[model samples]
Target chain A: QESKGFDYLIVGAGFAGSVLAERLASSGQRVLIVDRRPHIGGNAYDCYDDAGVLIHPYGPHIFHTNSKDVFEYLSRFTEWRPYQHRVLASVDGQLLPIPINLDTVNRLYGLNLTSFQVEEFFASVAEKVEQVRTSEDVVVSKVGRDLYNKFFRGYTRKQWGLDPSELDASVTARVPTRTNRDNRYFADTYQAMPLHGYTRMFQNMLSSPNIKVMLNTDYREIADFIPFQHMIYTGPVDAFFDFCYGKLPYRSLEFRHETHDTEQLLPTGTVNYPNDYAYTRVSEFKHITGQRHHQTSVVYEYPRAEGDPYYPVPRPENAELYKKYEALADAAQDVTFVGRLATYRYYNMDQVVAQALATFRRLQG
Target chain B: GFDYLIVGAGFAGSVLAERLASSGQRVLIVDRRPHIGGNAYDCYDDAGVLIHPYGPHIFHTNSKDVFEYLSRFTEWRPYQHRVLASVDGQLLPIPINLDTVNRLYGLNLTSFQVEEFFASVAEKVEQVRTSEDVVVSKVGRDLYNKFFRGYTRKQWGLDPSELDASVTARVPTRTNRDNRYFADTYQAMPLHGYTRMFQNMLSSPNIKVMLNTDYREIADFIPFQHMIYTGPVDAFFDFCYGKLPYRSLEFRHETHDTEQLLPTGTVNYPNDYAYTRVSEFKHITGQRHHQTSVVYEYPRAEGDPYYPVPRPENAELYKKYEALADAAQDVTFVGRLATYRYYNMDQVVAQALATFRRLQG
Candidate 1:
């Protein structure tokens, strides 16, 4: 067999893998990155569709974080393009702002109160919530049941495939009814997309000479032939151990993509169909990326656990099972399990990148 | 106008409000959004297709308590979930049943041969725990690359190997002829759409509902026992302490002129598109509509907090906030964004109901 080994056998080509690949290669360490997929950039991977619209393959990945180190670190690989994500909830045949912001409340109630007046007005009309025992408690404590029914009840049931009361309060507790005019979906310190697509960012990270990029190659394929000092794995954690423990429940999402004749497919970049649709949310790509393409791309999302893995069921029992497997992983010193799947938690691009940096530091130490 | 004030009007809020009101506690439920059901809300499209307003929610759970509890709220519809994974230009049954193994590679191997064949091809994975080891170790190279690698990359924004084994490990390779998507015992949908179900939950006399209002604006108005804030944990306190990190999703809804573009209503794009998976609402709710509306889901960093990024560091940081929330006497936090843990709709409701019973007594 060919006797070429590397200082590191990076298992993934996503942000975590790419970050490590770049660092080790720059430090003069021979690094070989083997991704089972033909491409890299992990879930944040993006490319142009047939119509030339920049597409986020894993759905719309909005890049926002408060980490200066992460932001500054990624700055080396890609430039930042500031973006503010806005969403419209389709309710009663009208598309309205989500997060129950100032405009959303006024438009629905037909009262145009300023931000402060809206706040005072809600104080005048809002009910009293004593203690929140469930998701209902969480919202009712804030806006009372009348508004909760109008906005959150059906939507919560549809989102998790369960009635909000049966599930944890946290499931239906996202997006508070806000009185402020702040329409930005999220207010984070760092908010931007790569000026170039995420693929280009990966290219920049893995472009070093010391780094060898092998695509469409699973580690098992070349397991016997390739020699490396250490393995860094970023895939799902349970599959690595062959799922010896009963399967850990993880949510899966289904996406539908389309090309629209006009640039703006939806009023806002995204829309939430709370009461009338099977799918949970909709996104018009033009709002996410300032793509100047004539045709726009939009994606619909469905969350479930039927086939794929999107979010790990956050029950205590599930976490305990994962911990058992996690202990097994600790003994396998030769390999390091990383990323959202390995950890079995949902993480953003910045977090993934930060994890890569930290893991590399540990590996070097 | 009520004894208790509830902020959201979704399943959690409605069920609790109904329960409290039935016990003779006047309750008023409010939502900043004009509608209810939170993310699980659904509405019919122009063509009468019952589109999942938030996303497709196929209600299936293994918990008898959950089913029996919600049974009081609405009737059940026999709904079996089925999905196909798009690999090499063909849509094969997900969960990798015997038919899937045969059709994907055009192999007519019997059950025994299929078993033996998979055994032969299976790579021995040591300490397989991440999504990488899950696929790479089982199917080895060619199949892993074709079936999981690209698709995983597309779905998670991370490579399968980089993700937790829980990621692909969640996808099973079945040896049986059964093709049902979910193995849960209580596999079914609401007989009526989710909206009607919510309405039933909040139909009690003591419960009153108000739409389009934020709780923070009127904290002084209603006299209440305490605050049960289910919104974003970070937002509830004005992000008072610090911001909690959440993963967001972007969705695209498409109305196809054609009836059905693919055999299955949903197909996961692991390699080619920015969107991870595409879903047709009809296949999920089993609702009859002439025109098929498909939704494309994308994972974005900015938008509604669809996911809670799980990492040890993030968890540790959240623990600090959770401790703070725990210390507070009157305020309680629940939901994916509140707890900073990714939960499914069913799981969320299950947790909410359990908590309600505990607090009720």
Candidate 2:
């Protein structure tokens, strides 16, 4: 048998594993980071194409957060470019701003309305619901039936392949209806992109001499062969427990990337096509990376039933299934479950980074 | 009879039209193009996407009066323009900032190091006579060859050596980390569209706009006391002095259904392609359309005059035209081609406003 020289074996070289690997190695612990993919940055990886256009291989990941700690922590690895994300929805032969803002209401209904009047208009049309249990109820009670059907209903149908009424209330609750004219997609204070690239940032994070990375190699395949004192698993928790309470539902995505000779494809960073096409949204890389190329590259994101899991299906029954695996995860000795897939929750990029940092603190203490 | 006949309806003509008409003088503005906002016009394409039919015109100015005057016509979208240069298969920030120097050569240079490095490579010119001299004196021949030489050749259809110093002086070289294309105090785009703003500017009762009408064709039919000629100065005099040199641009626009194309609004291919630059309208306009339109600018010596060729001989020839323009007391030559100077959009607006002030005074 090969000698178990490493102190910790971390699975998945994503935000969670990369953060933990850097922190553990810096504290005099030998860390071995392994990923199933050939690249290091996991889903956040960005690379240059044959046309010399920088594109996100998976999909567009816009980094935004209200947390100063996370922003400053990542700042050490790379410089930041100031960027604010804006999204549009194609509805009724017009492109309207998402989040159902004042301009959207005025443009959709053809009425010149002030910010205060937008709130009054929403109040008049809102449905009287006793319980906001489902995603449909959350939006209909706030903005009424017409606005919900145009924006939320069709988008949720395409994104998750499930009716809004079948999903949890938090799904629709995540999107806000604003009376103000602030059309930004996110209200986070820190909105930016890693200046060099996300992959360069990951390379900087995992640059410590005590850390070793193995690509195209799964940790499970060599779990018994390598000697490790502790394990940090960032893969699916249900799979780690061998589907003891059945497979937790997850929504996957199909990304199609094409490099066009033209300069641009969409006006904004993302445009949601809830009613028109099978793909939910299209993202332009120029709006994200700020690269200068004569040719442009764009990605079409199609939601599908089978692929690598991108989003956890948030529902009451899925939570019940995840809870059964949580018990097994908690009882397992010398193992810490972290990140979106590991805990079976929908988390942003910053949330995963914060989770890994907190997990490292607990392990150190 | 009209109080004034403006030859072109671009920034120079529109500003003069709004100012003169607002002061209770009846003004008639005519444009050869079938649009109101001159070269700054933006319209919806066949794909229902808003695009600048001409090249992309970003509004950035340090003068408060110019910004405030235009503010009444349209709401502002807060957008700071950033430009990147494609050189050696990498996108580096233009203006040769601290990051550009560090990225071009694999050196982790600080701001101070960048300044020192630029000084080391810079060749001092005893006299700055031409555009080539301006760049080579500031940065040196190697950096100039990599970034400015080819772009100048493509954009002007003349080598940098044949152009005036002002042509290259328009571009700034910086030693700081600021990657913004311009360091103007106010940088923004007109909300909705530039055409809508021009529509509001010309909505006054005292202003009458005639599109696709040349002033010379209608000169015998209509009567006017004074004239504002914003077209080519040499053409106004029938090109008697062998036609003062002017450069034109051919814009090839394409619309795609995908979301994004390049990373910024404008990308300069200094060392590649026949076209000088490609501008994505979505980055400048801030319109949230599912479809996007981009314009590839190809500069040529033919077509309608867009830029005056700024060379020493051309400037001398323009001086003779300027004398002819000065002799015509009733006609005022303004704008980029009008004064036979390569003026920017903001400068054209300022000159027109100044011309109005003198007329008012």
Candidate 3:
């Protein structure tokens, strides 16, 4: 009892399929974009809340990219908001600027170490090392033992559910002992939110005379009925091959959101509860995206096991399994796989678009 | 001076502490948090499910060494976890096997038809690689739309296309009748809980546990020969050159008075919800309790560093800091935060144990 055909059926309605859908349709090929979920926008998709706040339906996503191409390409759809993200951590009861800035150091220790004085003090306290191997080596060698434990130790353990010492130094070792008071969270250029939400942008992109979109419809339901020249899937690799080898390990996240009566609840848009709470952080949507609002919304994040893989565990065994699926993927022809789940790398939004546009060139050509 | 001074009284610090202690070294474990066990620090919720006070830590790994190693430390309870994705008012199995596929589509197909069904719907992605390749390569256009797109988008708060395919790629499909959620060689929860397991790991008298104490307060006074600092690498070095980037997470926990009612103890709300997935702790832990505790996890930038943001440039910047670490240290960095990489509970334990053994030898 299903419907009939199209020249191409783009599976996902996100950037991966959306970009491809637009390309195929512009070339005069008929394209039908369908999503099981009622609305489009994929994961990066955003919508205005009941309070008229433009919020990311899933979580907060700050769009940043080094590639001029990606920025220019997205610019075709909507203008940029040019927002630089700032973050803080709720340590004991205080909101400390993240990335361990000078303000963070001063607030953390209640000490006034000027830029030069800060260096001299760090030099005096830092333990000298012959060779640095683990994360412990990196931290202790620079800040000595005391500061490392106070700001990072317990917080690190809580965040990843592991100890900072046992991990590779590069993981929690991002923050440096800063003498200056620069408190911006990330050091990325061209950071901003979409002027229109991800959904509106996508809806405009796919609103072609040659394109047809069906929501709440599973592809498999009409796979036998519809006739299409080719297909583009942006999902898990193993599941595509029916997990022929075995299940790959994936890290999942759980989000808890609340709608408040007022405009603002937290000091910033988000704050990490490092050593105090079981959950990781809380995000106030309106703070990041300037959403029109009377009622405020906040989301609490927890890492768990019962959802789609948000994180790929970068361990040897899991990588080995992915390698096996990768081999299977190598043999998968006429089937073009793209996106984070297919690749398994923890990617930011811009990189994903970059990957998709690159994938489109390969697929179409 | 004590032979080794370990920071944090959680798994990473405790594992190394006990190992060094057993190897005939005095160790002092310090934690800024009020109690040990780090985020896995569990306590009874209002429901009394021996709940994961911080969140759920299900020990499911395929590593025999890691399993055996943990087995020696804590007695494990045989617990098999089941997940229910609330789609169209029905709780379906995750990993979206033949059964889930059929159930979601309301199809009455057997294993044979499921195979043919896959061949029919398989989106034929030629030369698939990357996470996107893996997903579209297998499921084709139909299944990917039904199961993956919404869920993936809702979970990470990013478009699946804009994310690494691996993000949504973790969901699996099957042609055979295998319905077990995870296909690892080993799958079981800790008999007691992660907190108790941590206690068992740190049970050695040679290990001293201190809580409600920040190292910054007494770091000047503690006399130790070598330090095993398990903190943020940036804060440790004080951003001498510049600040390195670390991604943080924020979590929210809720306790309910439900006698016992959830579709399947878990539901992933992918559409119109900021929170990606909801979890029930009792199902995973097998704690027979009167009430139930559930938690919602959101991934965002405005939080603590629950997981490191793994971008290539961020990693490259971390290396610059490592150059500073190389110049000086009587310390070893271990665990997720120290390394600034996303890792699971088992991997953290394994890494911590390995670091200690390496130092020991």
Candidate 4:
């Protein structure tokens, strides 16, 4: 016979759910953690291929953050494997370093310009806009139309399935142009990957004796049967309220993975094929997992209109629709909505951990 | 009708045509193909993407003579070719370098540590007779199975054991962090296009070029003092000692309206796909166009002969044909197919220049 009552019930078993479940159970409260998927790490889960090479079954999830709290909290579960992510755009036939760095500028134009001169070059080519509202304005106003077309335009269109001009400025602004030749994809203070893989880390986090772990169980089926004092919903907030206002749109992805009998596939971890093929990008796993195997594996990320919702569309209309769901969530007492789908915002892995830790503090008060 | 008749206007024929014509010798160069640059020919698609119609031809040489000689014909664009193999869902360097060893096994191995690692894994063979022995002796059977075995099987259409040791010896394993496919001192591609470079090389007044013309069709009618034959040696002798086995390639080209298709110049599938490798032309040519063009190279038993099947039996058969080539003293056999040696572009140019110097003396 299973436990009849619990102090807190967590849904989804992702970073948000797992974090909250671990904290509540450790503080001497009975907790039940559940997920629809069989795995514990959610989308961040990685597994070994038939050839014994480690791969991210969903897509490549790289960890990078400036928050010490998030890093320290995660460190409890797994050792940090030092890894700096570097990305290259396969543009026009060359693998130019992404973020339009000084090397990229010099190579693209066949000019021997220094980092200082590159700033002048960007200024000379940049088209100033009166107002920067959309992703198109954010890029073109800094680099000009020529570069915007070459680098950001096609990639943004493929990724969001909308023109850069139609999307919010923050979408393109997140990627910064570098004056120096810093080819590393992110400039974050700390960048690492889980040493034993993300699945092991999730497994360690939920190892507390006070927490009862269940997989392949939907929260809806057990919501009334299981007794709990409070609920933390990490799934879509709109779906929890039965989409009273309207359904919030999300951009999904279809991943195709293949194993080869060779050592590696691409020069870097991820390659953005902005202009060609049905897939948007190709990611090789060894660069992320840091495993030694003869056979290597790769994932081709094909953006799709429908799948398990991965990316929450950050458009004005979608935000308006989510706010209606947020009002209903705020009114529902004893229920806390958290995570990317719950809050209806794009949150990184670190952000979800930070949000969950803060939610635990709020509950303690 | 001409002082010299050069067949198969590839690197060898083009080099000879240029040298002979520049020295005021009337020369006629003819190729079976409709293009001038042969396999190195590159063209732009309707979408404005520059593509290699045949396959990617990356030029890298340690020979300063060969580098300087080609430099006169075309401006060089700096391109260090990097290749990765898609093995078991991971992308690793093909040459089994230090980074490849470290990343493949998840070990933070230094250069010295990597040498020890390779030494630990590598099986010692008494005599490296075949291609299989060459790789297995160096990296052991596990790594050989992972990296070389499947790739060599697809590329040459023969088991690694059936092939000669020289086939596998071309690719070398490095102890350093250098991820380049070739460790040659010089590596670059033609600035504009290879077709432009070929056009420049054949632009002498004394040189007359012909396309869609067979050497056999005009050999009887056109009279010349000597024949610089760059066609297959077995074909030249009418397979008098029986046909020498040769491997061909079928190139599948596709154009996509995307900026990039791959991370590097080429990606070797090695074990998975039927095709050997997929090459993005933009990575080699460095052309900035909206659309990108990529070529899938499928090794075939029959098609336009590209690589000579390098094996013990194939080499022995070609030896008999070499006797016929030796008898025809006036005919100079040059290039990869003519000599029946798997020579690269640089080697062909050097051979042609060396032949020209001997003829001048």
Candidate 5:
């Protein structure tokens, strides 16, 4: 007689929970999604300032995904505007296209080498390493010590709160090198933005009658009151287990959002300061949104070891602690954990959507 | 007698006249200059080498429709333009690629280090408003002085910092190794010459061509219901908003007995030069002759208006004139001068085609 109408109570209204909530509700299940924040979009949330400039209060989020399935799935909720992200590194007294191309090489030294000749020059400058390990080795092996010190060393030091040599090899492996003059940050097939903001998209997603979104209240506060049949936790696994083994570490970020009077501040969307400033990247939003306004907004990203966990610290000890939480999470019959915090994974936005879809299909089977 | 009086034999007017004539509308095309192809006119000099009278005009576009439409007029001669800047006594690529950096500094920095290399030098800008700000913020003040500052001063007769951000926004700096001036899909010139292409385009029986006469002098005598003007919008309005400032150029053509002379098609002198660039015609024409023709472009404050001046005040004045032009009937303003917007040749053709298609509705 006192059974809660909610068939599934999803914790954290982020990508993982929101995606699962939408799918489960669409499949005729009444879902209750809750978040600690006073909003719906989670870390991807964005809002218009007093100047009417849209800004990501959390940090700059540029949507780039090669997965057609994830792109089409999100398209059902919001329209998309074409946007390709281009990043310029502030180095050697110039802003050059990062993922360094032929232009970057030529502009630095006032040299004119064709693509074929640039390859020969690259080999000449690069230091040979037979067995590469750690972040410093990963960069020095490919570009030599001079470049590693300039671009990789300082950014890695501030980003991870440690030197490149002190970090794991996997930490600095994903950055690619380019030989062409292309300035785009990502060559993903689908590089675009939600036509509206991410907040609006989240609103559209959670607008379904079957989905009940509760904000400013953690699930723990109403756990006993709302008697749901099952629970899907997308929050911290250590917290979910109440730190049974130990706490899982993570790398977080602090953002500084500033509005400027000029139409544009940078040549491209984002500018990276590898060797300068406490912030790692400074991103101007107008370049990404194609927003036409006298005023533009920019967010400076400062990587920190605290705050809401953005990147899962990939140390061997942290992985072991996460495994213990995973087993405890799996032992529970009524609860399922799946998220960045819940699984201790560093996934791109598209990857989270894929994981959620995989979880939904598994639930169905 | 005509259904439409098309003023100027430029891409804008020529394209519109040809399209209208083919649609069974009688057209009278007039030009003040003694040529059919406007500034795009090219002819064999005393040395039998093809040389552009105004300056070099290399055609490049990403538009397929514009490429195909022009293909009907003349065969295409495949050409990818390359421009080099003479800096520190070295002929380096103008767009400033990796090789430009390496050659200038005598360093062999890879594309990867170049990225790391650039970040070390770039000064952060909170507000980018001027031409100087755009350059300084991206590459820092050292480069702004070397590569951009002096050249901009010569071209506009004003410091880059005094000009609008849009002025030096045309600066093409890269971190890659590509040395071509443009990265367009179609980069080819008219075969035979632009004059031959205009001849082929004007061959339609419905079209009537008039040269060495202003269009306004014949406008009263011609029986035309509509006018397609490719002249300066400010002059047509009789200086209502004061003559819109235009950057003009002085071209001094010279012919050399040698078959090939220059390292490339064009070499730009960024600093310590009276003229902006030196162009060798043989490289562009692909002509294997006993002699070569070259032209030096001296950007001047006075001459035939080549391109509209890029200044905030000039743009504001154009806005005032554009409002009046936008309200007009039976008058279509198109081209670089007509719209007071920078347009390449292919873009001019695209505008004409788009404007004609809208007329059908």
Candidate 6:
């Protein structure tokens, strides 16, 4: 087999592998980046639909980060447009902000409570708990039984396919209870989106002369044919080893997109239907992309157990299995495993970029 | 100018001096007041509690550039300001969120329902003309009377109808439950205090501070090419086009024997009170003290300027002073009183940083 004469063979043209490829190429190394998908930006890939409305093909990817290095590094490819996400949860025939803030409390019960008084209200409503052991306990201990049942229980059931009591505490811990009306879904230092689109940014990143991107080609397909000095794999780690120990459990989402005739649709960016829909949430992208369109596009998320890996189910058993794969990954000499699927962690968009940069730094060191 | 003379050593002056000195320029900063940091000056009172003598200067900005620029001097304590409006014998959240609406009217309205409720009660004004129009046109008459009218009347010593639309334009009615007084990316305070940050900022050998003296007093002696004026614009022109109006406040600072005097950081007595609002200092400073300090801001006609009056006539007069400033080549006027604009603490810092970059370019 003739070698491609590549210094680094980076798998998956996503944030993790693509960022590393860009970094290594910038360092004057010849690199070959490949992805199984036809597109470059993994789940974050967004493009204009057939109807001419801009839509995120996977789902709404709201880019937010506290890391300056990650932000500045990515800033090289794309200029950012400041976009904060707002979500309203549909509960008891009402749409309220999820995080279940003081406004949510008052609007639900018709009580006028001050920010100071809201603390006492939550205290009065909250169940007394010594230790927060489960997902149910995390919310009830802070907000109480009524709010926990109203906002937390059904959503967690549909999302994870288990009751809140059955899941880990870290599940509900990610969502915070606020006394104040800070309705912004995320509280990161910087919350924004790519100015033109993420696909454009990926195109810009992979445009380096030293870097060559090969799409619609799997790492396994090219491993025997193409030659490389070292490899960086971003696909599922379990699939890489062909599940010798066991397959890692992952939660997935089925997205149903629709184009509405109306320009303005939802009140905010997203609305979560906890009790009502088989679908967990609905997001209108015009609110997200800041695109003024006559016909707006929206997506409804339905969580599935079997599909493309989105979230690595956080359980003690899964954590044990991932450690085995991690050890297998660490033992392999010319191969590096990174990104969400390889590491088996639910990381934000910025975290993956930061990890990719960090991986480059480690390679140099 | 290699050597700089800066007036009013507050956010505008001190930040500029730090930039200039760090960029290898010598700066001589002077203030007519006894200290630096201007209206943002915070100090420990006799009761051993951190208090803002002028008023509560809550730092919040969407600008990361400004936040990072200030982060050079002192570490920040993440602080969000919460305000309550005392109306009809109950304290409710201001900036009028969903809770405030539900609390005022004993009706459980959803975010969508509450939006519809506001539309139902709202009067269709032909055009939003004044401060009164902005509120009544958005929500209704009752909300305007109970929350805005009395407060506006007390603060400016004028009725809401007389004031410009810009006065109450910033006050937004939220559909969802967010109750933060400001919705900025960075909501924080100087970790030690504002004074300590100023001390750190002016610690450079290239910079010199002159307190208890006006810039005009040292204008002849200070060897500098350019003057950065952050004092009153009309005062600089010696009131040629007549005095630009300003709202002055007298902070009646009091020490409480107990831990906290109020439920939150600041409480507004909108309907009935000689004083406009009461702020407990411990709530703001995060001071671990048994005793707390509080201030009840009394609106006065003749006092140190706190708020630049946002009337059109006032701006028309300020435009004349600004023309005079633009024509004066060596002088650059900045900050609230200098520009005669009601800018926030972060806005002033952003303005000063932008001005510095332009000068240093």
Of the candidates shown, which would achieve the greatest lDDT relative to the real structure?
Answer: 2
Clash total of candidate 3: 118
Q: How far is candidate 4 from the true structure (C-alpha RMSD, Å)?
A: 27.3
For model 2, what is the alpha-carbon lDDT of residue A296? 88
Tell me how candidate 6 scores on lDDT.
0.84
lDDT of model 4, residue A136: 92
Residue B223 displacement (Å), model 1: 74
lDDT at residue B297 of model 5 (Cα atoms): 89
Per-residue error for B152 in candidate 3, Å, reads 52
Candidate ranking under TM-score, highest first, comes to: 2, 4, 6, 5, 1, 3
Per-candidate DockQ versus the true complex?
A: 0.01, 0.01, 0.01, 0.01, 0.01, 0.01
Error of 5 at A286 (Å): 64
- Evaluation by TM-score, superior candidate among 1 and 6: 6
Q: What is the lDDT, from 0 to 100, of the residue B109 in candidate 4?
A: 87
True contacts kept of 2: 0.00
Distance (Å) between predicted and true CA of A349, model 6? 0.4
The residue-by-residue lDDT of candidate 3 on A115-183, one tens digit each, is 777778778989988987556778888878887776678766765566765555565555655667777
Off by over 4 Å in 6: A1-4, B1-361
List the candidate 3 regions with Cα displacement exceeding 4 Å: A1-8, A116-179, B1-361
| lDDT digits (tens) for residues A1-365 of candidate 2 | 54545788899889989999999999999887877775577789987653546779899999999999999989989999899999999999899999889999999999998998988999999998898899999999989999999999998998998899989999989889899998898999999999867887897898776776655456765575457888999989888988878877888888999989888888999998878988989999988888755678999998888888888998888888898899999998989999889998789899999999999999989
Q: Per-residue lDDT of A1-365 in model 4, one digit per residue for the tens?
A: 64346788889778999899889988999776777764577788876654546789899999999998899999999998899998999888999999789998889888899999989989998988898889999999888899899998888899889999888888888889888999998888989998878877887888776676645456775575567788999998878988777777878899999998888888999998878888889999899878765678999998888877888887787888888888899998989988887897788899999999999999999
Each candidate's fnat, listed in order, reads: 0.00, 0.00, 0.00, 0.00, 0.00, 0.00
Candidate 4 chain A: 10-residue stretch with minimal lDDT:
A213-222
lDDT of 1: 0.72
Candidate 5 lDDT tens digits, B1-361: 4688888888998888888989998787777764578989986653446789899999999999999999998888899999988888888887877898888888899988776777788788899888988888777677677788989899888999888888788766788899999999999988777887887787776676655457765465346788899899989899987879988999999988776778999988878689989999878867655667899989899888887877788889999989888887888899989998767899989998998887665
Candidate 4 C-alpha lDDT tens digits along B221-312: 45578999998988888878887888998889888878798988899887898888999988887766566888898988887778898887
lDDT of 3 by residue, B1-361 (tens): 4577787766678788878988888676777664578877875532234566555576677789889988976666776556766676666676667777788888988888887877776767666544445667777765566557776655444455555444455556777657566677788877766766776676665555544455554455445788887777777788775866554445688777674656555666645367667778777766654567788766675555565544445668788766766665787888777776567777887999889778867
lDDT of 2 by residue, B308-354 (tens): 88787888999998999999999988898889777777788899999
lDDT of 1 by residue, B37-114 (tens): 777787654343567766667788888887887788788778887777777787777777788889987888887777
